[PDB]
Every structure is written in structure tokens, then in C-alpha cells.
Symmetry: C5
Subunit: 166 residues, 5 copies
């Protein structure tokens, strides 16, 4: 079929790290979410499978276009749009890497904004463990086996939104 | 009948505890609401009765799926939705337990969010005693005795929202 | 006629008291609005008169049902709704008493909420003297003398909203 | 015509005064906007003229009804309504006076509200010089000279909203 | 065409400067770099001729920058003028370097609003893009881009935007 917005939930990343004083070459503490942000070659909660070669290409382009350019914002709740709204940004992805079929990453929670970043930080400090969701643009092929395969050309547009796990 | 959103009010929990420094392994104080969050085997304010077997099963699943996974958020006002919106979260349930036919629990008010958590905390520190409401999915059978009984399969989706009692 | 929402404006209470350290059973300061909150036996700005016996019963019920139970919240602006929305609460009434044909009261401004309470407090500390409005449910009888009389059964649902005085 | 909402823009007041510790009758600092709030007998940006007698009456009634009673709030942006919404208040007028054909005033910026007052104060401290607008109720007469004259009975309902000029 | 709203994105300005105490002393968070470009086909497939942009920038400096009115927002809205309740930056200066218009914008802090949102995003590491708003018309060239016609008016020099 034709290209559509593809929103996926990927579970709760296994590490939340608060208050580590990081060097800014001058120390800045931060609240970080770190762990699995996306997964290849598995049927996910939306009954979709991302082939490894396709997600490798999408992640590489997203790293080059957004992460390394310091634009890889994400929101609290995954809205039905492909772009992040910086007024609604709650996190920024600092790094992503592969470990087998899993995409790991590290995201910093935006604090001091009197908005979604502070809301996310306060939820986390009250004990919330967030889920993460990704947003992208692509198309699906049905398999007649109860799931869909993402077609070549998938584009990752937001690596992580923080979401309440279903 | 068919499955519907079931929102119930359960009154005002009997304890509000502010500022006790709790062990975080450091110390973090917190504002807590503790008391009756749900009741079985009584006709409630909505003329509904929750059989004990059905609510035991729903509470057990909610503890495993949301409380123990650190996902059991609640809001300020009970909205006509089955899901909690984390941008609107005001509390998180830390524990639930049975005492006879009553479900007790302990909920932490989310502070520092410049949102519903801080609104709830400020209302409470001004003297407000909140009521609590639960949200779930189920169906009802009529009894011809002025109340309805919740059918088997009831699912608890939000244990506590803070609400203004009528 | 049939029961309707009745909103009345009652003018500006004569006392604003900031920062008195009150005993807690240490000390908590507060910002208070104190003075006339309702009036019986006068044609008010809406050309309505509240008979003393009807307002006496409505005030007694409101004190027992809302003030003493710590539920007597009010908002900033009087909305076209019978009950207070706790997300929009700006004050809580701590006490009400009679003086002649006037209902006096003391209301605490909710502070620390980053919401309507802080907004009200900041307006006041910049010099605003708020007006107050009440909300209730009742019906009216016309008199052919240019005003209407509140009928038996009037129910007071919100004793005070802070409002901009006309 | 018939009575309508009249919103006017009057430019940028010439003085912004930050932090002067005033005797609270303790000390309270404040952020103030001071200068021309309305003008009589000039064709303004809306091609309207306010006669001096009509504006004198409206200003006196507004001083007596709102300023002296501590109700003379204004907002950030001028909304299409006659009355101020106190949830959206950004300033309060403390004093108004005449100087020739100009109405001067002093307005305090509301601070600590986590709302439009703090927004206005933050804009001002970043360097913004606000414009001001007035709101009132009245009617207009056409003159066939390219402007309209405000008719007798004009009522001033909001002395100052802070606006982008 | 007839006069329409023209919104352009111009990329990420190259310098973000936090905390320099400027003359009492007030620190500030500043965005500095390229705010507009002449004589290039931009991301919207539009080219601004230099003389037309020179006239628009001069008028904007005289009408808004020097009068302390040159506010901008976070996100570029479909409106010609800035809403001060949504202001996130103020332009303090603009200057030319070749075909590029440079500027200095101060981030509005303490507002518990878009200004604090922008500053907090930046302190978390965001490098914003910038967009300009103005009023003008376009001529098609049949070569895959449009040229801005004479009379273009610059109404908002900089909004902070998420770069595509």
C-alpha cells in the first residue's frame, strides 16, 4: 500500500539515571532514559515486524539527520503527526547504537521548561517508569499470518516519545 | 449488556500524610493519600455492586500490569477515558492490599510538575480532602432491586483519580 | 419555574489578610479573603432577593456538607456549572457565619499550584481587590415590583468564586 | 450608530520603571509602565477622535469605578470583549491623570502569577517596549473628512491592555 | 501573485551563547548567526533578490529592531505579526555579511512560557532552526523555483523552529 504514519510502542527502557554530573567542557547533572528504543526482526505490539536491513538504514539516516545535528527531540504522548513540536518536546536523544537486533539509545529529559519536560521529570521522580514510542513514515505488507512487514523505504522521524504503557 | 466504561466514586480516603522522609534505596519526603480506594460487596454511589471474586481478579491483574511495573498513574478529575494520560497524571499508586471487602492503597502525589500533581498538592496543603474514583471496563446486570451487579470480566484500568466529591 | 443555575455577584469583601502565621494542629502563613459572601433580604445586582429562612437553610447545609468536610472549593471566574472543578480551584472556604442579614466568611487562597490559586494570589498582591460570586440551584418567582424572589429549596453549591466586579 | 466595542491603540508609553522599592501602606519593589494611556482631540491610528469632554467624563467615571476601587486590571493582547478576565490580567492601573489633551497613567505589572503578568514582565526584562490599547463602549459619527468622532456616552471599560504595536 | 504570507526556514544559526554578563550586569542566552539569505534558492524553492531583502531588512530594523518590538515565537504560526503572549525571542541586532543577514537574538527567560521552553530545550542540547515571516508575492521561473517580487515586507525576522 501507500505511505502512512507508523507509530510503535516498544516497552519500558531498563535504565533511568538521575543526577549524574556530566562534563560540559563545568558539570551539568541530568535525568536520562537509556535502553531499548526500537527492535528489528520481531513482531511488535502493533503486529508489525521491521526487517533489520530496513531499520538499519532508517536509524542511520535518523542519526545523521537528527541525533548528530542536535534536533532529535521527542514528546510526552505520541501524537498523530510525523514531526516533533518543539513546544511539546520532553526529551532529546543524545546517542543511539545497535546491540544485536535491538536499537539502544540514551535520551535526556528536558528540565526547566515549565512544560512537558518538567512534567516527564516529575512523573519519573515520583516513580513512573515510562514506555517509549517511535514515529515514522512507511508502508506495510500483509503476510496472512497475523502480522505485517514494514516495506523498504521506511523513514524514522521521531526516535522516542515517552508514553504510558498499554 | 455490552462492555462499557465504568467510573465509580469511593469517597474520601482517611489519611493524608505530608512530608515523611522515606528511604530511597538517601531520603525523599512525599505527600501521600492512603485509605479505601475500592469496595466490594456494597451498593456504591452509582447503585452498582462489585462482587468480591470479580474485583479480586481485577485488582490482581492491575497490580501485576500497572502497580508493580510502576505505571499506575491517576489524574485529577476522572475523565471519560479508560487510559491515564501521563501529561495529566497527578498521582501514582505505590501499593494496594485487601482488608475484608475493601481495597486499600497508598498513592503518591506527583510534585514538581507545574501541572496536575502540583495542583493536587497545593489544594491538599490548603486543606482540601480529595475524593477518589476508579476507572474500568465492564458490563452490568440489573437486579430489579434498585442496583446493578458488575459482570464477570471487569477490568480495572485506573485505580485512583483524585476527584471532588458531590 | 423549574430549578436552574443561579449565579450572584455580591461585591468586594472588606478584608484581605496576607501572611498571618496560623497554628497547625508548626506555623503556616496564608492569604485570606474575609467579609460578606452572600446577602439575604436585599435585591441584589441580578434583581433577585434571597429570603432569610431560605438562605439560612442553604447556608447551614453547605457548611455541614462542604465547609466542615473540607470540600468548599471555589474558582477564579464563576463558570456556568453547578459544582467546583478542583483543577480550577482558587480558594477554599474555611468558615461562614451570619451578621444581621449578611453571610460572612473566610476563604484561603490556594497557593503553590502554578494555577488559578497562584494567579489569584498574584493579582491580590499586585493590589486587586476581588469581588465574589456564589453558585446555587433554585427557582424564582416574579413579584411585579421589578425583582424576583428565590423559592424554597434553594441549594448553595459554591459559596465563593473570585470574580472581577462589574 | 448603536453602541459597539471600541478598541484603540495608543503607542508605547515612555517610561518603564523596574525595581523601585515602594512603601507598602514594609517595602515592595515593582515593575511599572508609565506614560500616555489615551489621547483626546487627535485622529488616532483607527481614524477615530475622542472629544475632550467625552473622554474627561469616561476617565473620571473609570477612575471612580475601577481605579480607586482597585479593579482596573488589563490583559496582554486586547481581546474582543468589553471586560477584563482576571485569569488573564497582566497589569493593574494605579493612577491616571491629564496632561494637556493626553491621559497619562501608571500601571503595575502583575508578577508571580505564572501567567500573563510574568509573561509581560519577562518580555519587558528581555527588552520589549510594550504598546498599550484601551477598550470601551460607544458609538461613532462619520465626518466626511476621513475620520469618525466618538459620540457622547462613551464608557471606558479597560484603560490599558499591553499589546504588540 | 497577489500579496501572501511568506514563511521561510533558514537552518540552524551557528552560535548559541549562554550566560555572558552584559553591561549593572545582566546575563542572557543568545542565538547568533545567519537569520536570512539573499540570492540563494532556499528550502522552499524561493530566492530573495539582494536589493529586495536589503530594503525589507532596513525597514524591519527601523520599525521593529531599534524600537524594541522585534519579537519572535517558538514555531512559526500562519500569521504575519508576532503574538507577545507567545514570544520566545527578541532580536537585538541584524547586519549583513555578503549575501547573508546575520543577527543576534536574546531568548526571553522567566516567562514560564515559550521563552523558558526555548531556553530549557537549548540547555538540554537542542540547536534550533530559525524561520522568518513576511508579506510578498512570487514569480515562477519554470526552472523549479520562485523569485520574490519587489515590495516584500519582513514582519518577523526570527521564529525558533524545529529543523526538517
Amino acid at each position: 500500500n501507500e505511505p502512512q504514519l507508523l507509530i510503535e510502542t516498544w516497552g519500558q527502557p531498563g535504565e533511568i539515571i538521575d543526577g549524574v554530573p556530566m562534563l560540559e567542557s563545568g558539570l551539568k547533572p541530568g535525568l536520562y532514559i537509556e535502553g531499548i528504543f526500537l527492535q528489528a526482526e520481531v513482531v511488535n505490539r502493533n503486529k508489525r515486524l521491521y526487517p533489520k536491513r530496513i531499520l538499519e538504514k532508517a536509524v542511520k539516516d535518523y542519526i545523521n539527520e537528527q541525533v548528530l545535528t542536535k534536533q532529535a527531540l521527542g514528546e510526552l504522548n505520541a501524537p498523530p503527526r510525523a514531526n516533533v513540536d518543539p513546544m511539546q518536546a520532553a526529551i532529546i536523544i543524545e546517542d543511539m547504537w545497535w546491540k544485536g537486533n535491538d536499537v539502544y539509545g540514551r535520551a535526556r529529559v528536558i528540565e526547566g521548561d515549565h512544560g512537558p519536560g518538567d512534567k516527564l521529570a516529575a512523573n519519573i521522580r515520583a516513580g513512573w517508569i515510562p514506555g517509549v514510542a517511535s514515529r515514522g513514515l512507511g508502508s506495510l505488507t500483509d503476510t496472512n499470518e497475523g502480522y505485517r512487514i514494514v516495506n523498504e523505504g521506511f523513514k524514522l522521524t521521531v526516535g522516542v516519545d515517552a508514553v504510558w504503557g498499554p
